[model samples]
Target chain A: SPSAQELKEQGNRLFVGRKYPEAAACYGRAITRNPLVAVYYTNRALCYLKMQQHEQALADCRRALELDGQSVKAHFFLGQCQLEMESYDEAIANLQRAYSLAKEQRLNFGDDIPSALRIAKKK
Target chain B: SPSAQELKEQGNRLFVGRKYPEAAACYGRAITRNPLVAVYYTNRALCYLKMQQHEQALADCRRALELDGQSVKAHFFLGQCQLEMESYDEAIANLQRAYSLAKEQRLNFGDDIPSALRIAKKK
Candidate 1:
């Protein structure tokens, strides 16, 4: 059987595809299986983003990130959400972490990596 | 033809997958197609996040949301981003918007609404 994380990933793929309602259903099921992992809620929030359900997405991202601060995806997604809402100063602040956390995990491999960005990620 | 929005979304998917380089290319390409859409800048910011380019991510996010004020995802994502950066004041400000925007959208999916965060996002 596919674990909850696996199911969540599937939903996430659909979410990135802009398949909001479908992705929500998948995340909804995953939440049942993996209630403890904040990522599941965050995934659901992404689905809400596609559906234009800003509040649900906000709630989910908050729950997920609060549950696990290590999830760069959650942080990035959440910052994006806030930025869309026109919270400028806040956008800069949140997105900044999404930037730092990704580098912290050594998950990025962009060609235009600034020397500073590259050095920071390696740290 | 897949519209610029489609391509931007594709870039966002790659970004969520932790494929920072490819995602950056996708976002960069989207930026070329529709430079006016704030979502495009915000999406590119995600790639910056993965690469740990905090300055870049903040700049992109600020630019994006500056263009589009209706993107709730931007606000929430920005809020989470700030939270991870430990810019509490900034985080709270963004989070408050996330909460307000969530409520504005009329989507009540959680009871933990009263975060009462003492720290702000980094205003």
Candidate 2:
């Protein structure tokens, strides 16, 4: 049986290839292997977003945040799912937190913060 | 050839049936027949929201507002699409405008505005 890290690697490759459903499967296996790993759920949530499965993505992101509240990707993607679900305030809160965390931690994920923040603050 | 009003009525029937794609088509035909009618675009935008096609809905709502800025339904649905697109600030502005307009005009369409406004204001 492949380790969770190995499955994550496979998932990353598939994600890079834009095979979102396949990537989601790999991340799902990773989560099954290591349920405590927040990144696995975040990755799967991202794949679900690509598939336009907003509810599933939202659930996954919520689980990821539950497991690791400091997971920037989880926050960012949660915001994205909420936005799709029209939970504007929730999305803004999560997105703003993610952006601030990225800046504080020097994390390099989710480069679309400017546009997302701009859109979220339009009103 | 069906008149725009007749097609709008048909679209309204489909909208009431929750046949969003069908309603969208009907509204599209109505718009084709009379692009000057702001309500046609607003109706189609509502259908697009039900279908989760936020971008298209946003475009249609923007067009509707351009043709008739006082359209309460247009403002309401446009705010909804903006929220889904993570344009929270813009969503709040439009939703507030819609809510105020509805109150002022005593319009009863989109009875869910209160909840929408609450959600948009959460953050």
Candidate 3:
């Protein structure tokens, strides 16, 4: 089996090239090699999200979250997946947690904007 | 009113941040400043699409096409708007043209992949 790092790098390259299917394959290999890395599943979920495969993305995100409850990326991506799947309340909650974690981590990452912030300001 | 280019940048920044309403406002201001700039309306339509305001997005895309019939972004975004609005036939037609134009121009643009391509391969 390819090393998790190697597979992750391959997935990243394919993702940047917009080759989502290929990227997903690499992520799958990474998961097989080392299933504990939450980012691998999160990365694969991103590929599924890009493909508009919301169910698959949600499942992958859930798996990632299960493995690493502290994973900010997993929570953030799960929020995005839920949004696409029309699971609005779940999406909102997950996004809130993501926003909190991102704030605590001081991460500059931008994915789906926190609906809690936006929705509160909507009116 | 901001110039079309300035407004486009503002909209793009907001779009990249997933802030759809702010981006739409920027695009709207740009279109008002230069009504002939089809791309301004196209950008606004993208904001609307992300916000799930499909009717308004479709309207903006239609206006964009009316102003500049040859705009690839307009056609491609129009297809996306139409698809979101369930105007499947029109979406298919515009998306087909978008693919053809992208091929002819050798432009590397990411769009909602052609429904025609997906539909044709489905059966």
Tens digits of per-residue lDDT, candidate 3, B14-112, equal: 988999899999888887777888878877887887787878978898899899887767787786566555455665577556645544443355443
Mind sharing the TM-score for model 2? 0.46
Winning model by TM-score: 3
Give lDDT tens digits, candidate 2, residues B4-91: 8999999999988989899999999999999999989988887887787888989999999999988777887887677667565676
Q: Which scores better on lDDT, 2 or 3?
A: 2
Model 2 chain B is weakest, by summed lDDT over 10 consecutive residues, at B114-123
List TM-scores of chain B, every candidate: 0.70, 0.83, 0.79
RMSD of each: 12.5, 9.8, 13.8
User: A35-86, model 1: which lDDT tens digit per residue?
Assistant: 8888688668766765667677777888888899877667656765665554
Which residue pairs does candidate 3 place in steric collision? none
The TM-scores, one per candidate, come to 0.44, 0.46, 0.48
Candidate 3, after superposition: displacement of residue B91 in Å? 36
Please give the lDDT score at residue A97 for candidate 1: 70
- What are the candidates' individual DockQ scores? 0.06, 0.04, 0.04
Choose the strongest candidate by lDDT: 2
Candidates, ranked, lDDT: 2, 3, 1
Model 1 lDDT tens row, B35-103: 898777766776666676777776786776788765555665565555445464675566556546544
